[PDB]
């Protein structure tokens with residue numbers, strides 16, 4: 001299932017629990033950027049997915065503030081869990097930094113992360 | 121400045137509480153605001169933003185399942201809160217639907233939402 | 241139609257010609273209007289759109305190199321032209337900068353530009 | 361290193377010439393290799409990239425109209441070319457369909473393609 005410890009292609013660590021109420025809760029540790037140790041995450045997932053072979057839709061957010069550092073930014077991952085020989089969560093993400101209005105055009109990075117239960 | 125009710129450009133409404141712990145909790149719904157249009161939201165925000173005039177980074181997720189409906193999808197909004205005389209939350213979003221692998225190319229919509237404290 | 245001089249919400253100037261073959265050609269520049277901030281663009285558009293009221297899909301690219309400056313980056317805009325008494329081109333864009341592999345996570349900005357034939 | 365034939369990870373091919381003026385021209389074949397599935401592409405690239413291990417920024421567009429078919433849509437790919445023994449073009453894409461204003465929310469898909477010089 002979704003609950004577990006996952007790693008993305010850069011070796012970030014995503015520790016998540018899927019609640020029966022559709023909640024995702026856990027911690028995220030980033031292999032990149034202005035980040036140190038674990039950050040709180042929260043999200044949601046479809047707790048009654050289609051039974052037709054489709055993946056399970058989900059998303060979560062990390063705001064990049066913890067007790068050590070504050071990057072004044074937040075990442076949301078939107079994606080789906082794909083059950084499988086090798087279970088995977090395939091996502092695309094948006095990383096918005098707090099900016100002045102003049103710099104808002106350059107506030108948001110986009111990318112795609114794939115997570116499995118094995119570290120690269 | 122974030123806690124309360126916000127309205128997007130399209131008719132949607134959300135009500136959120138910004139907790140002291142950096143949490144965002146609430147519900148997302150339609151203009152009409154009927155029970156069947158209401159979904160849990162959860163997210164995170166920067167609870168200690170920069171003091172140089174930058175916005176406040178935040179993000180949240182809604183999975184489009186409630187006790188009545190299930191669209192097998194989830195949206196994440198990633199953006200920033202701008203305070204001042206015309207307060208706004210400016211976002212970009214990713215809506216991922218659960219798909220088969222063959223259809224994963226058409227799984228993810230992208231767009232933008234601007235939220236205000238007053239109705240459009 | 242599409243051929244003409246457009247401006248985005250930030251004052252950039254998009255001078256484009258829509259050819260009979262689906263080609264878009266022209267130049268993209270900044271508000272100041274100077275040679276050093278002017279760049280070549282090329283793209284494509286649907287030369288036979290639907291007749292049901294839908295917009296006309298289009299996209300184009302600017303590589304941020306000209307005879308004076310090189311930012312080692314390129315932007316693509318993807319969107320549609322909406323006809324009527326206020327013609328508009330609504331777009332989302334991706335701006336990729338050349339990076340090392342280690343920095344590829346932070347290579348791509350995303351945003352949205354709306355273009356009209358009037359200045360903002 | 362850009363000019364030539366490239367293959368994505370899902371059975372598409374394209375064929376591009378990278379002109380000394382920074383033009384990309386060519387054809388994109390959504391399948392392999394029937395003419396009903398071939399479309400014009402044009403774009404731009406950084407014709408003077410860094411030789412510091414950074415990728416070469418580029419982008420291109422395909423409008424999904426040819427002599428056989430018309431999906432009333434256009435994709436733009438934004439990315440970077442990475443040279444060497446195992447050369448790649450790493451992209452993120454936006455696929456916008458022409459829509460009515462009421463449907464504009466669901467107009468734009470996002471995703472990622474990775475192209476290699478060898479077939480997958």
Ligand SMILES: COC(=O)c1cncc(-c2cc3c(=O)[nH]ccc3o2)c1
Pocket residue numbers: 128130132150156157158184191193195213215231233
């Ligand atoms: C009541 O159920 C729905 O209407 C519904 C179903 N599926 C998706 C959405 C929806 C609403 C919404 C938005 O306000 N901004 C960005 C994406 C987005 O998606 C709404």
Ligand SMILES: COC(=O)c1cncc(-c2cc3c(=O)[nH]ccc3o2)c1
Pocket residue numbers: 248250252304311312313315333335337351353
């Ligand atoms: C690395 O980026 C640059 O150096 C650069 C230089 N000069 C203009 C622009 C630019 C302009 C622009 C716009 O109007 N919409 C969307 C993206 C975008 O990027 C970018």
Ligand SMILES: O=S([O-])[O-]
Pocket residue numbers: 030032033034035064071073
């Ligand atoms: O991943 S954010 O800390 O730069």
Ligand SMILES: O=S([O-])[O-]
Pocket residue numbers: 030032033075093095111113345
């Ligand atoms: O690098 S973004 O996945 O936080």
Ligand SMILES: O=S([O-])[O-]
Pocket residue numbers: 110111112113344345346347348450452
């Ligand atoms: O995750 S994309 O920035 O290579």
Ligand SMILES: O=S([O-])[O-]
Pocket residue numbers: 230231232233330464465466467468
């Ligand atoms: O939210 S953008 O797809 O019109």
Ligand SMILES: O=S([O-])[O-]
Pocket residue numbers: 104105106107108210350351352353
């Ligand atoms: O404000 S959006 O164009 O980064």
Ligand SMILES: O=S([O-])[O-]
Pocket residue numbers: 225435453455473
């Ligand atoms: O045309 S998009 O599915 O790479």
Ligand SMILES: O=S([O-])[O-]
Pocket residue numbers: 224225226227228470471472473
């Ligand atoms: O699988 S990503 O290209 O939607």
